[PDB]
Amino acid sequence: MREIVHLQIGQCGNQIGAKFWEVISDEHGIDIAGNYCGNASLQLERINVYFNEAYSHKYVPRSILVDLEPGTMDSVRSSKIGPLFRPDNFIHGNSGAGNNWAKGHYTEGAELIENVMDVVRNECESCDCLQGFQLIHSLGGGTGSGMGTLLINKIREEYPDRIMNTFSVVPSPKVSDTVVEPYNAILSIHQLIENTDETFCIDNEALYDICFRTLKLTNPTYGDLNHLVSLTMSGVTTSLRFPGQLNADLRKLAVNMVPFPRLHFFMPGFAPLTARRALSVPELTQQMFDARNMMAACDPRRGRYLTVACIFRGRMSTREVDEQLLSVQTKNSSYFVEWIPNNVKVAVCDIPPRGLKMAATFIGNNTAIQELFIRVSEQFSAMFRRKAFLHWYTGEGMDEMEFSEAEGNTNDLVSEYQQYQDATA
Amino acid sequence: MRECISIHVGQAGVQIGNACWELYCLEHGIQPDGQMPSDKTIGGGDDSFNTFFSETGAGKHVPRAVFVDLEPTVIDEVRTGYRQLFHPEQLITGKEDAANNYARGHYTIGKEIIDLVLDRIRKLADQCTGLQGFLVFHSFGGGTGSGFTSLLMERLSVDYGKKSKLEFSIYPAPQVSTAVVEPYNSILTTHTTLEHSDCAFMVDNEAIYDICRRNLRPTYTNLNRLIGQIVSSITASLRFDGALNVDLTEFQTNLVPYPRIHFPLATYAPVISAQLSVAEITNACFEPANQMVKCDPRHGKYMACCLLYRGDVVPKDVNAAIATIKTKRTIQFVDWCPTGFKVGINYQPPTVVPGGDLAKVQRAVCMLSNTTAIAEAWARLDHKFDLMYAKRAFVHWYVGEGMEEGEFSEAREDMAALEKDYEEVGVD
Ligand SMILES: COc1ccc(C[C@@H]2NC(=O)/C=C/C[C@@H]([C@H](C)[C@H]3O[C@@H]3c3ccccc3)OC(=O)[C@H](CC(C)C)OC(=O)C(C)(C)CNC2=O)cc1Cl
Ligand SMILES: Nc1nc2c(ncn2[C@@H]2O[C@H](COP(=O)(O)OP(=O)(O)OP(=O)(O)O)[C@@H](O)[C@H]2O)c(=O)[nH]1
Ligand SMILES: Nc1nc2c(ncn2[C@@H]2O[C@H](COP(=O)(O)OP(=O)(O)O)[C@@H](O)[C@H]2O)c(=O)[nH]1
């Protein structure tokens, strides 16, 4: 099997990665000592993408936890999966950037990028073959977004023939009190347009909306958001973790879902979302394409699905799933582009996530993601027309033309998204 | 005195080839370990299966098969679940898949492995003294099965220009498709392997799925077993006693008039759940819903017909079935000596998998017929190609691996010329 090296940058990336790894190790039947204890041979199949095989039946993950504060590493080690992770792969700085993108992109990310490059090269030179790099980080923070984009640039320089999959978390004002987050988000969006081939746009605004409306929980606690994003990430990666008709092993997913090198912003979603219940096929399918259910602040009625990869998990009849999805596609033919035929790919995995009898995960390159890049850019416009906190970033050697370049690139992306939405077959 | 070297490219090619060689060992009575109970008393070749099976010094009947794929999972599946039957030297694996990209299998990933496959092909051909050609097993939708097939066809046309090469392609279907760019791969591998292929039995999985649904969703195992049965009864005449179509030149001359029009159509009557008269099973071979290509032959004109009967079928009533077929006004032949149904009958009954998907039957029939009804399928494929090229969708995944932008326009011009030539054949 091929090998993926997992990279987590920032405390948001570290926390969501720890919850995601716990969900995977519960799903794959791996205990805290790294020994297999599951009851299905499919769980041990395709395990080399994520878990490195150590001595004496020890399946440790190939996770590179990167941060600039040791408190996040202490919180990772204090959890249940702390001894399960590789102790040699821990990289932590002394001083955090603290919502400073320039400090994590030009000084401290630059001063630790040689060490993380040495760790990445040590992991890569032991690879029989490299499949790609999976990155999970937040676009709003200081070392998260800046160090993620610097790692992306270094990986694209070193390995230009490898895929770059990013679980970029777009910041939102409803859960984050910091004001300078449109600067970091727009700068990282401009870097991810030019130096990345894949992006899973998980938005905290839609997560707060889901926890407020669906789960009826007023408080947007970070544990519930961690659990929801971990469940959606497990449902997304069930194609890579288990063999099937739709393998979608990174490059195949990019060939199927990405028609253009700039328009590679996905929209993951999870239909049976329940906090810490009859499940059937048509209710899951009608919950799959709902605006409220999706984890990005978008309106799918205003956009067109360029590609859809709906994956079902559990024990279900495949014929009924195919019939229901064909009925959905024919009933809503105005919601899909007519110049890309057969854009809906369905795969069924027999192993459900733990805690759920059935699961339904959807990935889509909808045109409705340009509403998110209009919202973040217009919050960036209200923070750049009055130059709020501009002395921090421009004092680190960043030119003020960099913000104009990022705004122009995001406006060009919005213009190209609208232009390709207006075209019809 | 004659040999054939089977070539399987892609996951579909490897799985179809493994199922087909399993059915060939089942039909000929060859043991799975490689020995033969009855025919190993001679210990030599030319026993009517020497065109496919080679005998080593230990008496093992190893097939003359090359399994090539850029993913080693299916190769290790063949090598584990067979192992002593297939030599590991002739089973070539690969490291990185082309991942539903023609240009990846044609310019970068397949080009680093084409020389080893050519050397293995020459090594297997050195044991053959009177070899006829190669059977290419591949699939149109994949990345390996299109790009590496096109580069292999180019290399075998440059190096083996005195030989004729068949083709066993899988036409993409919307029911089971793992990619969106299957029209792009299919059009590009049709344009590249137009001048290098002489008989292409392109069968779509939609027809096999519909047959499995209405006679037998069914998985890839049932589709693989039915397709292996179809291909085994297609190539039943080549491994048995000589009546007709026992050579690749016979296949190229009985059905293919043009250098470009080399797409036959197969049709199978006896699909029953695990009797029937000769007239109805001859009539069922003319049913458009039982064909291996989802198309209507009544809007086109036939060019040839090679009915191959299997089992204990009396040859007297075959001519009466032919007369009752020809009395109907559905079949409209071409008007330059169209001949008719060149029936050859093999008296050995076909063997089905014990407890598999098809029941054992006594009367079996296959209709290898050329027509102009494949032009509808090529029109569908070019319509899907034209819908994804007006806005230049998915273009960058091919140009980034060394291909050019003008190759798509060249393949579009080639497919327009193929459609125009099919229309010119279809118009008196
Ligand atoms: C328009 O009027 C306003 C309305 C609201 C507010 C809200 C008000 N200020 C901001 O968000 C400003 C962020 C700019 C960055 C600047 C750009 C960082 O590079 C600076 C840096 C920091 C540390 C080390 C090196 C460099 O500071 C932070 O991130 C600091 C980090 C420090 C305390 C550890 O953290 C916070 O700010 C808190 C303490 C967590 C919360 N702060 C707020 O709620 C402010 C104003 Cl002025
Ligand atoms: N009938 C049948 N078709 C198959 C089988 N396996 C793959 N296919 C066809 O393969 C097409 C997609 O190609 P891929 O999934 O990339 O497999 P491939 O053609 O071997 O190409 P590679 O994966 O690169 O080797 C689908 O449209 C299927 O019709 C099989 O076992 N049986
Ligand atoms: N969904 C989710 N988002 C988070 C979580 N923690 C932080 N974030 C987001 O991440 C951003 C802060 O980035 P952070 O990782 O703290 O950057 P750092 O301090 O430089 O390491 C904020 O805008 C939050 O919206 C979490 O547990 N869940």
Author numbering:
A (entry chain R): 1 to 276, 282 to 430
B (entry chain U): 1 to 81, 83 to 217, 221 to 278, 285 to 438
Sentences from the paper on this structure:
This tubulin preparation comprises isotypes α1 and β1, corresponding to the genes TUBA1 and TUBB1 from Gallus gallus, which are orthologs of TUBA1A and TUBB1 from humans. TUBB1 expression is critical for platelet biogenesis, representing 50 to 90% of cytoplasmic β-tubulin, and defects in its function lead to congenital thrombocytopenia. To achieve this, we took advantage of the ability of Cp-52 binding to induce the formation of stable tubulin rings that are amenable to single-particle cryo-EM to solve the structure of α1/β1-tubulin.
In vitrified ice, ChET-Cp-52 rings have a diameter of ∼22 and ∼32 nm, corresponding to ring species with C8 and C9 symmetry, containing 8 and 9 α1/β1-tubulin heterodimers, respectively. The best 3D class was refined by nonuniform refinement, resulting in cryo-EM density maps with resolution FSC0.143 = 3.2 Å for the C8 ring and 3.5 Å for the C9 ring, respectively. At 0.5 to 3 μM Cp-52, the main species detected for both ChET and HeLaT are the C8 and C9 rings in the 700 to 900 kDa range.
